[PDB]
Ligand binder design. Structure first.
Ligand code: A1BFG
Length: 185
């Protein structure tokens, strides 16, 4: 892929984070804390899951960014509508305003309804995410395997501004503490 030149500088929006997340001072890294991080509640915070949004909102154009997932057992990455549900239980699907992929229990899947099996020969340490707003496309790339395609959502109905979407995952196992990191351009 030759999408690298649409690179955008993503930063995390504290105010949207689940109350157990710890965001770095530069707003480029996030991890699960071992307890509530002593912040007030607000209607923006994801309540049920360890999720946070990027600060940037996209309504046009082509955008590309990279995320480091080194040594994580579980995570969700992609984009979502600015108006996604924050409170209670929900599934990651385009019907709910999410265009995402994840790792869970040693398999990779795309957030369709129902979910789609991905075929990855080289477990990724970094993921590239490409959005073409006008074309209605979200694509994922394996940076570890020379940028090979993972998955393309096409005919997307965004139906509003898009925000970068992150889930660091739970850490019941003690093996999923590692952060998500936004990689430098
Ligand atoms: C082991 C582990 O990852 N537990 C974290 C945890 C426990 C209970 N509720 C949580 N939230 C929904 C904020 C997070």
């Amino acid at each position: 892929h030759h999408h690298h030149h649409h690179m955008v500088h993503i930063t995390l929006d504290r105010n949207t984070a689940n109350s157990w997340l710890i965001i770095s001072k530069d707003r480029r890294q996030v991890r699960m804390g071992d307890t509530h991080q002593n912040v007030s509640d607000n209607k923006e915070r994801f309540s049920n899951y360890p999720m946070v949004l990027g600060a940037q909102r996209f309504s046009s154009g082509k955008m590309y960014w990279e995320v480091d997932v080194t040594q994580k057992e579980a995570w969700d990455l992609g984009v979502c509508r600015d108006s996604v549900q924050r409170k209670g239980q929900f599934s990651l699907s385009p019907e709910n305003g999410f265009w995402t992929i994840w790792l869970w229990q040693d398999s990779y899947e795309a957030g369709t309804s129902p979910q789609t099996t991905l075929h990855i020969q080289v477990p990724p340490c970094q993921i590239g995410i490409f959005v073409d707003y006008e074309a209605g496309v979200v694509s994922f790339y394996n940076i570890t395997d020379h940028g090979s395609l993972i998955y393309t959502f096409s005919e997307c109905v965004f139906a509003g501004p898009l925000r970068p979407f992150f889930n660091v995952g739970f850490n019941y196992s003690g093996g999923n503490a590692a952060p998500l990191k936004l990689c430098p351009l």
